[PDB]
Structures are given as C-alpha cells and as structure tokens.
Design an enzyme around this catalytic site. Structure first.
Site, short mmCIF file in Angstrom:
data_model
loop_
_atom_site.label_atom_id
_atom_site.label_comp_id
_atom_site.label_asym_id
_atom_site.label_seq_id
_atom_site.Cartn_x
_atom_site.Cartn_y
_atom_site.Cartn_z
N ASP A 1 39.65 -2.19 -7.00
CA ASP A 1 40.71 -1.53 -6.24
C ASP A 1 41.59 -0.74 -7.19
OD1 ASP A 1 42.40 -1.36 -3.64
OD2 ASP A 1 43.86 -1.85 -5.20
N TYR B 1 48.09 5.09 -10.24
CA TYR B 1 48.16 3.98 -11.19
C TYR B 1 48.02 4.57 -12.60
CZ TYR B 1 47.39 0.68 -7.26
OH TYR B 1 47.45 0.01 -6.05
N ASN C 1 49.89 -1.06 3.94
CA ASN C 1 51.32 -1.20 4.25
C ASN C 1 51.66 -0.69 5.64
OD1 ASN C 1 52.41 -2.27 1.64
ND2 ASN C 1 51.64 -0.32 0.84
N1 LIG Z 1 48.45 -0.72 -1.78
C1 LIG Z 1 49.64 -1.18 -2.15
O1 LIG Z 1 50.74 -0.92 -1.69
C2 LIG Z 1 49.52 -2.19 -3.32
C3 LIG Z 1 50.71 -2.82 -3.86
C4 LIG Z 1 50.64 -3.78 -4.96
C5 LIG Z 1 49.36 -4.05 -5.47
N2 LIG Z 1 48.11 -3.40 -4.94
C6 LIG Z 1 46.72 -3.63 -5.52
O2 LIG Z 1 46.60 -5.06 -5.57
C7 LIG Z 1 46.22 -5.50 -6.92
C8 LIG Z 1 46.78 -6.88 -7.07
O3 LIG Z 1 48.21 -7.05 -7.09
P1 LIG Z 1 49.26 -7.06 -8.09
O4 LIG Z 1 48.70 -6.52 -9.39
O5 LIG Z 1 50.51 -6.62 -7.65
O6 LIG Z 1 49.29 -8.57 -8.26
P2 LIG Z 1 48.63 -10.00 -8.47
O7 LIG Z 1 47.19 -9.65 -8.55
O8 LIG Z 1 49.11 -10.82 -7.43
O9 LIG Z 1 49.16 -10.63 -9.87
C9 LIG Z 1 49.03 -10.10 -11.01
C10 LIG Z 1 49.78 -10.76 -12.17
O10 LIG Z 1 49.16 -12.01 -12.31
C11 LIG Z 1 48.61 -12.24 -13.64
N3 LIG Z 1 47.41 -13.05 -13.40
C12 LIG Z 1 46.16 -12.62 -13.04
N4 LIG Z 1 45.28 -13.67 -12.90
C13 LIG Z 1 46.05 -14.73 -13.20
C14 LIG Z 1 45.66 -16.19 -13.22
N5 LIG Z 1 44.50 -16.74 -12.96
N6 LIG Z 1 46.73 -17.09 -13.59
C15 LIG Z 1 48.03 -16.67 -13.89
N7 LIG Z 1 48.36 -15.36 -13.86
C16 LIG Z 1 47.35 -14.35 -13.50
C17 LIG Z 1 48.44 -10.84 -14.20
O11 LIG Z 1 48.54 -10.79 -15.65
P3 LIG Z 1 47.25 -10.48 -16.58
O12 LIG Z 1 46.69 -9.10 -16.23
O13 LIG Z 1 47.80 -10.55 -17.99
O14 LIG Z 1 46.20 -11.55 -16.25
C18 LIG Z 1 49.59 -10.07 -13.55
O15 LIG Z 1 50.84 -10.25 -14.24
C19 LIG Z 1 46.89 -4.36 -7.77
O16 LIG Z 1 46.64 -4.47 -9.20
C20 LIG Z 1 46.42 -3.16 -6.95
O17 LIG Z 1 45.02 -2.90 -7.26
C21 LIG Z 1 48.22 -2.48 -3.87
#
Ligand SMILES: NC(=O)c1ccc[n+]([C@@H]2O[C@H](COP(=O)([O-])OP(=O)(O)OC[C@H]3O[C@@H](n4cnc5c(N)ncnc54)[C@H](OP(=O)(O)O)[C@@H]3O)[C@@H](O)[C@H]2O)c1
Length: 325
Positions: free
Chosen positions: A52, A57, A169
C-alpha cells in the site's frame, strides 16, 4: 482457510486482494533514502504480496524499484503483486484524475495499479503544493464533486490503467453518494479507513459488508504516534493489557494479536514497518487463530477515539468524521 502462501480475499469486481499488505508511509525527514525499497523487497521475500502506497508519501519511486526488481529476478510475476495507489485532495478535478494516475504509473514504471482510491473525500485547491493555504494559513479548499471525480476514476479502469477502484476516509454518506449515483459503472470495492481494537469501525464495517465493500484497516497497529498529526489521547495500543495477555497465550506479540484480530473478521490489514524483524513479525499471523470469546473481548476494547482525526480540516464540507460513521 487463510495461509501464508494463500490469503487473498474476493473483491466485488471479480478481483482479489491479499488480506495483509505492507504500508509504506514514513516521515520524509526522518527516513533514510532507500528504506522503503529495501522494506518492500524484504516484505516480498517474507511473503507479502500486497503493498500500500501513495504518490504523496514521496517514495512511490522506491516502491516501484522494489517491485520491478522482484519481478525481474522472477520472485513474483506482476500478476502476483497487488499495489494500491491513492488520488490526493488536490487532484480531484475530473480532468486531473487520469493524468494523476498516469504520473504514478510512470513513477512506479508499471502498466497499471491493482487498486486506485480517492485518498480523502475532501477536495483541495488544485496545484503544485499538496497542502494549499493563503498567506494567513487558511487552507484553500475546493468544492468537492465526488460523483464527477468517481466517473473519471471509472474511465481509468475502462482504459485498463487500474484493475479495481476504491475510496479512503469515506463515511456512510459519501459512500452512498457514489453507490446511488445514476449510471454507476464501477462500484467502489474497498474503503480504506483507520481500524484497530481501539477503533473497531463496527457500523461502517457492517455498512460496507452490506454493499460488498471490503474494509482496509490503515494504521492497524495504532500509528507511529507522531504528535504532529496523531491524537495521543489514547495510550499505546500495543501496550494494551488484554492484547499483551492474549499474546502470551499464543506466544505472539500484541501487534500479531491485533493484526490477526482484523484479518479473522475479513478486514485487510496494511501494517507499516521498515524494520527487518518487525516486517517478518507482522506476517506471522496464519499459524494461529483467536477464539470467538477472545475476538469478542478484543472487539470490546473499542474506544470510539481515532488516532487520526485530521482536525485541521474539520471545517471542510467533506470532512468525514463529524457523522457517527
Ligand atoms: N489512506 C489514508 O488516509 C491512510 C492514513 C494513514 C496510513 N495509511 C496507510 O496505512 C499504512 C499503515 O499505517 P500507519 O503507518 O499509519 O501505521 P501502523 O502501521 O499502525 O504503525 C506503524 C508504526 O508501528 C511500528 N511498528 C510496525 N510493526 C510493529 C510491530 N510488530 N511492533 C511494534 N511496532 C511496530 C512502525 O515502526 P517501524 O517501521 O520502525 O517498524 C511505525 O512506527 C501506512 O504506512 C499507509 O500505507 C493510509
């Protein structure tokens, strides 16, 4: 039913989507160059077949570099990879939709994306800056016309530039606005929204399932908790008492517990990690399953509090978070 080697679930248009995918958003200033490419490559080697991302980004070229290399060496064929791109707020004018998708295909250096979605229901001032504002800091909004924007997305699928169309969203109202559109050609097959034990999306999930719309849980692990945009009101999701307790029962981390929670209820998860070990950890969720009672106790953790509020745009006509869902 779901296994490491086979975990794709059906989309209403006849296509399918891997129930787990690698999120790729990472703060530009605090992320080494090449980190996204390395991670996408590690993810694919681990078993991920869904990635994704989004042009905004600022690393979509790294995503393409990794996918192409993995295809080049024969690790996967293009068809085995599922990539989701997104149409940002400043590109909702109908005439700009296709040129915006084409830019992403050029950045990825791929012939098509598997899923293209409207990033947010709010339309911003068309231009170079992705965050339009006058000298007073007042955000420059644009009148949204989701129906018109959608028809342009439809034309993109008709041209073969994308296999599936979706949104992100979007609340029930904004979804209905499209689902009831006169002469609707391609219905959205997915709605990517915040979803985890602290924000279970109970009603929106039911609505989507009712219309055969699969939910993609973004921030499935509760976000990186970056104060610049993350509402830190709630304590860290991964530090939750019950989640960690259940983890011990299955010798799994709380992260693996929350990821398993969503895929077991048919919700796609796209956890982001640019760390070798965590990328692998998040993928190990097919060798165990939660009981109906644990699923209930986990769901009972819902707080109806978002980590992603996007309050700076609460005054925009299309803000999606005022409504109950
Ligand atoms: N469409 C929208 O409006 C929207 C909004 C927000 C996000 N997204 C998409 O959703 C994806 C996921 O969400 P997000 O990045 O916000 O958040 P997330 O995936 O919920 O969390 C990411 C955070 O968690 C850490 N992490 C990852 N695996 C872990 C584990 N097993 N244990 C402890 N910590 C861990 C990561 O650090 P490290 O990388 O150092 O592991 C990072 O700081 C995005 O990257 C993007 O592709 C879309």
């Amino acid at each position: 039913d779901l296994s490491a080697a086979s975990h794709r679930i059906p989309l209403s248009d006849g296509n399918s989507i891997p129930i787990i995918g690698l999120g790729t958003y990472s703060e530009p200033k605090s992320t080494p160059k090449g980190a996204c490419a390395t991670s996408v490559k590690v993810a694919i080697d681990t078993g991920y077949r869904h990635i994704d991302g989004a042009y905004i980004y600022q690393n979509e070229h790294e995503v393409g570099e990794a996918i192409r290399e993995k295809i080049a060496e024969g690790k996967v064929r293009r068809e085995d990879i599922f990539y989701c791109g997104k149409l940002w707020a400043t590109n909702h004018v109908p005439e700009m939709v296709r040129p915006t998708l084409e830019r992403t295909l050029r950045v990825l250096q791929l012939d098509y994306v598997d899923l293209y979605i409207i990033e947010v229901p709010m339309a911003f001032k068309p231009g170079d800056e992705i965050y339009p504002r006058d000298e007073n800091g007042k955000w420059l909004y644009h009148k949204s016309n989701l129906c018109a924007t959608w028809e342009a997305m439809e034309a993109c699928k008709d041209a073969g530039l994308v296999k599936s169309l979706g949104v992100s969203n979007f609340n029930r109202r904004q979804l209905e606005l499209i689902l009831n559109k006169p002469g609707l050609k391609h219905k959205p097959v997915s709605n990517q929204v915040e979803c985890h034990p602290y924000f279970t999306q109970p009603k929106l999930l039911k609505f989507c399932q009712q219309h055969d719309i699969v939910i993609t849980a973004y921030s499935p692990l509760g976000t990186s908790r970056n104060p610049i945009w993350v509402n830190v009101s709630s304590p860290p999701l991964l530090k939750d008492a019950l989640l960690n307790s259940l983890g011990k029962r299955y010798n799994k981390t709380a992260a693996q517990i929350v990821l398993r929670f969503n895929i077991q209820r048919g919700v796609v998860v796209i956890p982001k990690s640019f760390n070798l070990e965590r990328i692998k950890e998040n993928f190990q969720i097919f060798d165990f399953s939660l009981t109906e009672e644990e699923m209930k106790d986990i769901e009972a953790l819902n707080k109806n509090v978002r980590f992603v509020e996007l309050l700076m745009w609460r005054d925009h006509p299309e803000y999606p978070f005022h409504d109950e869902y």
